[PDB]
Amino acid sequence: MVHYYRLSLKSRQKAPKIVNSKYNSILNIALKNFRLCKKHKTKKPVQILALLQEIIPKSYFGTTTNLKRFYKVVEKILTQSSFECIHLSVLHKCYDYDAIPWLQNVEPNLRPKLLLKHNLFLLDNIVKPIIAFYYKPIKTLNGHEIKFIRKEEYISFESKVFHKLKKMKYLVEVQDEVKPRGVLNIIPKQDNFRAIVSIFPDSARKPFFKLLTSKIYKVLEEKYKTSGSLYTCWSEFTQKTQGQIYGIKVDIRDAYGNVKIPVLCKLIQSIPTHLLDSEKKNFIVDHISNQFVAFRRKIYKWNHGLLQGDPLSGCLCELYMAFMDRLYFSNLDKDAFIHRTVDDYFFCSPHPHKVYDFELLIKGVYQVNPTKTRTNLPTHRHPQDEIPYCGKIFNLTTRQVRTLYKLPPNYEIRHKFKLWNFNNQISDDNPARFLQKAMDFPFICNSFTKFEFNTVFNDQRTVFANFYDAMICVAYKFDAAMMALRTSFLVNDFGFIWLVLSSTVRAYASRAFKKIVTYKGGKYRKVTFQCLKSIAWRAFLAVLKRRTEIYKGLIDRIKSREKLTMKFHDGEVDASYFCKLPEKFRFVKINRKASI
DNA sequence: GGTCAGGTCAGGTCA
Ligand SMILES: [Mg+2]
Ligand SMILES: [Mg+2]
Ligand SMILES: [Mg+2]
């Protein structure tokens, strides 16, 4: 019933010094070297693969091919995605049992389970602990990517910023024995850091916190009418404005930290008693007024703004910023466009000076991140026509909007897709359910909306390029899923690949059609259902080509058998873009190699 | 049977 092994470190166990009667004594040799390895200073850089080869005797696998099979799991662990799993069957299936010396005495039909439990034993008591001993996993928050850093380096970085947080009196030792609400975590974010609190589980009170969060959001509904859909605001303003659009995006820095609690507390108290009674009012007030945080076996008062990671901080910060909005942006030219997400403001106007004035307005009220500022003002140092905002790329000159893709160079795209679900597991004999759950539409649903498929302000050329780019992503997910089928399902029958493959292509083109015609626009000429199918299949073509020999059968099959049109009813579309791979996805890395 | 509204779950988006 349980077919999965989680790759994550927290699964690890603490090794006994001696193995029990149900395990073969060879394990104790391994454990010995483990202990001795821990006593190594290991000041210089270390490769975990290497140390394991000097911890687990080759005599345990016997043959190099057996050893390589096991280390291929170790490699997956060292390069793991959050939530990633393998099939427990991987740990015993396809091994050369003749070459394993300590298994010759036992009858053949009992060897796989034995090998499984011994390989499980090494993974839980030696492999994961050794990775944990020298490294800390931090989640980059780009997809499910996990970066490992040396414990010596993270602790120094965590100590440096801890002192900074003490000298600036953001963190102040309380020394009153007050109960901490959670543990402070310092996480690395580029050159900076993020101080957040991980809240101790509060089973009997988070129902209460959902109630207070709900009531705050009710307050934000009643006062301050809705901001507009971002799509409707960009639609109307583009229709309104016939001249060259001018715009700016500014990034407010540390919005949670720059909230003035005294001002926030007065907003809380001013809520009408029918909305929020005085007891609840006062509970929120001493909640944000007494933030207590546990660092290294010491309790501190967080004294700078709102605590990130706390459940109330989001709605409470939104309430503060909503109040700041009218204090300073209630009166702006109504022929202008403005939108705010949480700490990001996007403002556009046909007049440059009003965009210029907006930058000064915002800078006078808030501390911003100047490197994160993007603007088409001609005078500015580094002007651009493309403004990234809220997951989209807005071209102020063309008015076209494209999806924004966060794929740094050398990012491993398999981190974008969570293909394993521990709560609902798929057996190693059932590969098809795995692949089709992978191709559930919901995962790309956010790039199949009116914003990318409208023709109101969007050209057919960019609506196509949007659909292609999304499909490129679905291909990359298909690809990652295939490697999962190869490396842990160990499938040999790839015949079942086609049905859902093209079965997904159909529905995706179909899913696009209904959106596109639901949001017909003035630039809409004519788009053929079949053209979307030709685009989807050409998207897969461009991706599947990265590992041609593995898929050369597949590429040839649909390359010939299936039909590529690109005769869409528009002449502007280069159609050249569809044949190749967009530069964004040329530079992403689909192979797995350990580096720690 | 065919809807609805509500509920769960899921992999995704925004800061
Ligand atoms: Mg929640
Ligand atoms: Mg920011
Ligand atoms: Mg929010």
Residue numbers in the entry: 1 to 596
Paper excerpt:
Although the human telomerase holoenzyme is composed of multiple accessory subunits, catalysis is localized to the telomerase reverse transcriptase (TERT) subunit. We found that, in terms of global protein structure, minimal rearrangement is required to proceed through the catalytic cycle.
This substrate mimics the initial TERT:RNA complex bound to telomeric DNA (state A6). In this orientation, an unpaired 5’ cytosine (rC) of the RNA strand acts as the templating base and a 3’ adenosine (dA) of the DNA strand serves as the primer terminus. The resulting structure shows TERT bound as a ring around the end of the RNA:DNA complex, with its active site positioned at the terminus of the DNA strand. Residues I196, V197, S198, G309, and R194 compose a pocket around the templating RNA base. This pocket uses both polar and nonpolar interactions to stabilize the templating rC in a conformation that orients its Watson-Crick edge towards the incoming nucleotide binding site. On the opposite side, the 3’-OH of the primer terminal 3’-dA points towards the catalytic metal binding site, and side chains from T341 and V342 coordinate the deoxyribose sugar moiety of the 3’-dA with nonpolar interactions. This binary TERT complex also has a cavity in the active site that forms the nucleotide binding pocket.
